[PDB]
Amino acid sequence: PVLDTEGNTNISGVTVVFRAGEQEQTPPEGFESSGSETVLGTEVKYDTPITRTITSANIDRLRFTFGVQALVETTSKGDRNPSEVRLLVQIQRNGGWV
Amino acid sequence: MQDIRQETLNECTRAEQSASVVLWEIDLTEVGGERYFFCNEQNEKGEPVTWQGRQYQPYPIQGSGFELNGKGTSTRPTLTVSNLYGMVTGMAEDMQSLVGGTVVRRKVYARFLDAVNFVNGNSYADPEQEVISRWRIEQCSELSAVSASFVLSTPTETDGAVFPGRIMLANTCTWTYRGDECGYSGPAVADEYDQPTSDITKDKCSKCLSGCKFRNNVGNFGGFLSINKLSQ
Amino acid sequence: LWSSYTEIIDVKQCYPNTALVGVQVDSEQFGSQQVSRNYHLRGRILQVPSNYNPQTRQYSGIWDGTFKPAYSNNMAWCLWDMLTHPRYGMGKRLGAADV
Amino acid sequence: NGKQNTYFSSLDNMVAQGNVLPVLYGEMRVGSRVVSQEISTADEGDGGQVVVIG
Ligand code: SF4
C-alpha cells in the first residue's frame, strides 16, 4: 500500500491524485498534457540509422529519450575518462532530412 | 398479468367477442421523418378508423411473429407495409433514415371503439381499454414495388443495446453537440469539415479534437486523445 | 541507444465524466521494475430509494417512490441504475416509468 | 559512487480505441487502464556533458 494501517509512508515519491466521475471535474493537478509513451529500447550503430514515422493525428510536441549504454574509455593502462559520443534527430520535412 | 382493464379481461374470456382491431403508429420524429397512423381496416361508414379521438388511415399493413419471452425473442417480428403509390420508396429512399424509428401497435376490441366509427353510435365506447407494444424498426429487409418488409425488436433488445455504454476513443468525442456533457452554449463557430462559419443553422461539431478547439471546449472533449489508434 | 519517445498533445482535458486516478511516481525513490498500480476502489454512487439507509441496509417506512444519491451494494439498485442511466445505461432508449 | 540508474523499464500499454469504459458497482479492487502515459527525464547530474544544437 502507499500508506500503512497506521499512516506510515510504505513508499516515497508517488503522488496519486484521485477524481470521482462528477460532471464538472478539474484536470488532475500535476498533469498538464496528454502525452503517450512508446518504448522501442534499441541501439544505434554508424551506418544503420533508424526512422520511426510518427503519423498520429494530434501530436504537437514530440520528446525523444536516447542514451549511452556506457561511456567508459581507457588509454594504455587504466585512466578511464569521459568518451564524448554524438547523436542526430532528423525530420523528413519535404525532400530529405533536416 | 398484462396491465389490461376488467372490461378487456371480461371481453377476452367472452363466448362471442367483437372483432379485435390493430392500430399502428410508425413514429420517425427520432430519425428525421414524422409520425404516421395506419390501420389495416376502415369502419362500417367506409372512413378512416377513429380511436381516442385520433384518425388511423386505411392502409394495407400487417405484422407477424410477435411474442413475449422470459429468455429473449429469438424471432424478430416482421412488419410488412403496402408500397403501391411508392409511399415507402418516398418515405426514406435510403432505408438508413428508417432504422431506429419506433413502432407502437395497439390491440383493442371493437366494442370499446368511439361512437363516430359506428352508424348507431356505441354505449360501450371507452378510450382506456387497449394493449400497447413498442418496437424499433431495425433494418428494412426488402422493398419491392408492391410492399416493403421491416424487422422490429424490443427497445431493450437491439444491436445498439449494449451495456457498459460509452466506447473509449482517441480523437472522437462521443458527447452530443451543445448537449450537457459537451456543455458549449456560445455563438455558432464552424461546420463539420472545420470551415469557419458564423451561421446558427450551418454549425455542427466535427467530433475531432480540431472541431472541439473551434469552440475552445477542449476542456470537455469526451474523447481520450493519446490512447492507442489500433483496435487490437 | 534510443530507449523511447513521447507524442505530447498539450490540452488540459478533465475527462469530464470518467473517474480516473493517475499517480506520477518518481524513479530514484523506487525500483527499476514495473509500477503495477491497483486501487481498492469502492463503487458508483447510484440512485437508491429515499427512506433507505445504505450503511445500515435499512428501510424507514412507506417508500413514497422518490430517489436519492448515495453509494450502496444493493444489486436491485445496481440493476435499476444500469437500465436507466442516461449517459452509459439504457437511459437513452427505455426510460424511467417503463421500468 | 552515487545511485545506479532506475529507468522505468517496461510500461503497461495504452488502452486501444473502442475498449468501453468500465462501470464498477460497489467495493471490488481494480487493475490499471492506461489513458495517458508520459515519462519525463530530467537531469540530476551536474555540468554540461549533454549539449543540444538547434
Ligand atoms: S468536440 Fe468538444 S465541444 Fe464538440 S461536441 Fe464534442 S465535447 Fe462539445
Contact D18 B164 (CB under 8 A): no
Determine the length of chain C.
Answer: 99
Pocket test for ligand 1, best of B171, B176, B182 (most atoms within 8 A of CB): B182
> How were these coordinates obtained?
cryo-EM
Between the alpha carbon of residue D52 and those of residues A41, A89, B119, D48, D49, the distances in Å are 21, 10, 97, 10, 10
Helix (H) / strand (E) element for A90: namely none
**CA D21 – ligand 1 centroid, Å:** 18
Q: Round to whole Å and give the CA distance between C50 and C71.
A: 13
- The residues, any chain, with a CB within 8 Å of residue B17's CB and separated by 6 or more, are B11, B109, B111
Between the alpha carbon of residue B211 and those of residues A25, A32, B111, B172, B220, the distances in Å are 22, 21, 58, 10, 12
Q: Round to whole Å and give the CA distance between B80 and B123.
A: 35
Q: Round to whole Å and give the CA distance between B135 and B133.
A: 7
Q: Round to whole Å and give the CA distance between C45 and B184.
A: 26
Q: Residue B18, SS3?
A: coil
Quick one: cell of B193? Answer: 469539415
Beta bridge partners of B79: B63, B150
Q: Round to whole Å and give the CA distance between B115 and B121.
A: 4
Report the chain B residue with the minimal C-alpha distance to residue C11: B218
Dihedrals φ, ψ of B111, to 5°? -60, -20
Q: Round to whole Å and give the CA distance between B225 and C20.
A: 15
Q: Residue D34, SS3?
A: strand
Between the alpha carbon of residue B23 and those of residues A97, B9, B62, the distances in Å are 72, 19, 10
Pocket test for ligand 1, best of B173, B176, B180, B194 (most atoms within 8 A of CB): B173
Q: Give me the half-sphere count of Cα atoms (radius 13 Å) on the Cβ side of residue A10.
A: 7
Q: Round to whole Å and give the CA distance between B169 and B160.
A: 17
Report the chain C residue with the minimal C-alpha distance to residue D39: C6
Q: Round to whole Å and give the CA distance between A94 and C69.
A: 58
Q: Round to whole Å and give the CA distance between D36 and B79.
A: 48
Q: Round to whole Å and give the CA distance between B151 and B143.
A: 12
Q: Round to whole Å and give the CA distance between B65 and B105.
A: 13
Between the alpha carbon of residue B118 and those of residues B7, B49, B122, B229, the distances in Å are 20, 10, 7, 65
**CA C87 – ligand 1 centroid, Å:** 15
Q: Round to whole Å and give the CA distance between C84 and C77.
A: 10
Closest Cβ–Cβ partner in C3, C4, C34 for D12? C34
Query: Which strands make up the sheet holding A61-66, listed edge to edge?
Result: A36-42, C2-8, A61-66
Residue A6's region, left for phi above 0, alpha for psi from -120 to 50, else beta, is: alpha
Residue with grid cell 489500433, as numbered in its chain: B230
Q: Mark out the alpha helices in C1-99 (DSSP H runs).
A: 75-83
**Four-point Cα dihedral B173, B178, B183, B188, nearest 10:** 110
Ordered DSSP codes for A3-44: B-TTS-BSSSS---------SSPPPPTT-----EEEEEEE--
Please answer whether residues B14 and B3 qualify as being in contact, where contact means their C-beta atoms are separated by less than 8 angstroms.
no
**Gap from C31 CA to chain A (nearest CA, Å):** 10
**Gap from D28 CA to chain C (nearest CA, Å):** 6
Q: Round to whole Å and give the CA distance between B189 and B107.
A: 49
Which residues on A lie below 8 Å from D38 (Cβ)? 33-37, 63
Q: Does B229 touch chain C (CB under 8 A)?
A: no
**CA D24 – ligand 1 centroid, Å:** 26
Dihedrals φ, ψ of B133, to 5°? -145, 120
* Residue among C83, D4, A82, B94 nearest C92 (CA): C83
Contact B170 D13 (CB under 8 A): no
Contact D37 A63 (CB under 8 A): no
* Residue among B182, B176, B206, B202 nearest B192 (CA): B206
Beta bridge partners of B36: B26
**Strand pairing class (B36-39; B54-58):** parallel
Residue type, B187: P
Which residues on D lie below 8 Å from A33 (Cβ)? 38
- Angle at C60 (CA atoms; ends C57, C61), nearest 5 degrees: 135
Q: Round to whole Å and give the CA distance between C96 and C78.
A: 14
